[PDB]
Design a protein around this ligand. Sequence first.
Ligand SMILES: [Zn+2]
Lengths: 123, 72
Amino acid sequence: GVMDVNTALQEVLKTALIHDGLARGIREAAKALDKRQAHLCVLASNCDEPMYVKLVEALCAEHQINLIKVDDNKKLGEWVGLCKIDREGKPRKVVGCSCVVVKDYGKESQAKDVIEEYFKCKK
Amino acid sequence: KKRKKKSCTTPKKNKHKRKKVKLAVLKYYKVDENGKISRLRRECPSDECGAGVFMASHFDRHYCGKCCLTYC
Ligand SMILES: [Zn+2]
């Protein structure tokens, strides 16, 4: 594993964007993740709603799902693929995603090398 | 025959504007002190919405929004 831990979510969310397995927004995340058809889930740390933490922490606790936390909804909005870009490639427009739910992974040695390591060391 | 203007009738039939509920997704689940999950409404038996969608409690009826199921 040559990668850094924080930069390697990019490959998980990219292949999950290509395989049409990502569920973004809190209700399309929570519900379909409670369907036990979705493996792992990505959540934002910084939030203006206290209950928004309780919901996903409780849900990920009981339903045997793993919890990752990111800095802002903005960086997560750059991972999700909702960022609209300029003529020259400036990531100008950002729609932030606090809730991300993973259903269908791609096959990657990289993102899985960092996520499986981070979650073998977290356990 | 130059086309007549004639716009008069019951003045306005307004069209339904979406009721914007702010963070209504949160109302479904009840979290206790331990971090437990209490579901305050009923699960729906239909196939498509099964295990992923809940129903509504109106006073006399239970209503799911996907398959339009109704009970008393
Ligand atoms: Zn239903």
